[PDB]
Amino acid sequence: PRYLKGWLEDVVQLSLRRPSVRASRQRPIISLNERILEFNKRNITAIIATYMRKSPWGLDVERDPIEYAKFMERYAVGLSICTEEKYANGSYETLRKIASSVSIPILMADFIVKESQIDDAYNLGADTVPLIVKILTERELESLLEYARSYGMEPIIKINDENDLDIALRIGARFIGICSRDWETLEINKENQRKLISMIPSNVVKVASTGISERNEIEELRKLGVNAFSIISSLMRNPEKIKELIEG
Numbered sequence: 001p002r003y004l005k006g007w008l009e010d011v012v013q014l015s016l017r018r019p020s021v022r023a024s025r026q027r028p029i030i031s032l033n034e035r036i037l038e039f040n041k042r043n044i045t046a047i048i049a050t051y052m053r054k055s056p057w058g059l060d061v062e063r064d065p066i067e068y069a070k071f072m073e074r075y076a077v078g079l080s081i082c083t084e085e086k087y088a089n090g091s092y093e094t095l096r097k098i099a100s101s102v103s104i105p106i107l108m109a110d111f112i113v114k115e116s117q118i119d120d121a122y123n124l125g126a127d128t129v130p131l132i133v134k135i136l137t138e139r140e141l142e143s144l145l146e147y148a149r150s151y152g153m154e155p156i157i158k159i160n161d162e163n164d165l166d167i168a169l170r171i172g173a174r175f176i177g178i179c180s181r182d183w184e185t186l187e188i189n190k191e192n193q194r195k196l197i198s199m200i201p202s203n204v205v206k207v208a209s210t211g212i213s214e215r216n217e218i219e220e221l222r223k224l225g226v227n228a229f230s231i232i233s234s235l236m237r238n239p240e241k242i243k244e245l246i247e248g
Helices: 006-016 032-041 065-072 092-099 115-124 138-149 162-170 190-198 215-223 233-237 241-246
Strands: 047-051 078-082 106-109 130-132 156-159 175-178 205-209 228-231
Touching: 032 078, 032 205, 047 065, 047 233, 047 241, 065 078, 065 092, 078 092, 092 106, 092 115, 106 115, 115 138, 130 138, 138 162, 156 162, 175 190, 190 205, 215 241, 228 233, 233 241
Parallel strands: 047 078, 047 228, 078 106, 130 156, 156 175, 175 205, 205 228
Antiparallel strands: none
C-alpha cells in the first residue's frame, strides 16, 4: 500500500492480515452500477444505504442488521455493509447473512488491500468492493481492479482530490465514489466535491458521499450529473429518512 500514517496506517496493516474464507457463492452477481443506471432511467432517486455499527464520524449504533436490510431492500439502490473489524466492529458473517436475505446489490465496505479480500467478498455474496486510491499504489490499484473484474465485479473507485481522480481515470475507472470527507483530517469540503464531480466524464457512474441530508441537495447534485448517493450515518439512526429522500 501507499506511504501511510495515522489510523489508516494501522487499518491497512490489519487488512493485510485478514484471514481469507472458504465459502460457496449462492446468488449471482447483481451489478450495483447497472442498477444505478436503471434508477436514473426510471427517474428514481438512487440511494446507497450503509450498515455500519461504528464510525469515527458519528456514534455507535446497535440494531438488527436483518430488519434494517429488509427495510432498505424496498428503497435503496444497493446496500453497503462494513466488514472492517477494529474501527467499525463489522463482520464477514453479517455480510453473508444480509446477502442471503436480500436480492439487491451488495457492496462490501472494507479496506481492500489484497486479492483474497476480493475472494472473500465474492464467496460471501457481495457484488462489488471499493478501491481506495489514497491507500493503494497505482500498481496495486490496477491489479485489484482487474482481479475484481475477472469475477464480473465492477469496483467503485473512491477518490478525494484531483490527484485521486486523475489516477482513477488513468486506470480506467467506470464507477467512481466522490467523498467530501478528508479521512485523515475528517473535514467535509463540499466545494471540493462539486469541483471533482464537474471534472468526470458523463459516462462514469458517479456516487456522491454524504454531505447529503436534503432532497434539494440530491436534486442539485443530480443536475450536476451525480448518479447515486451514499448516505451512511443518518440512515443507520433513522432508516425512514430514506423514503422522504426518494419522494417529496
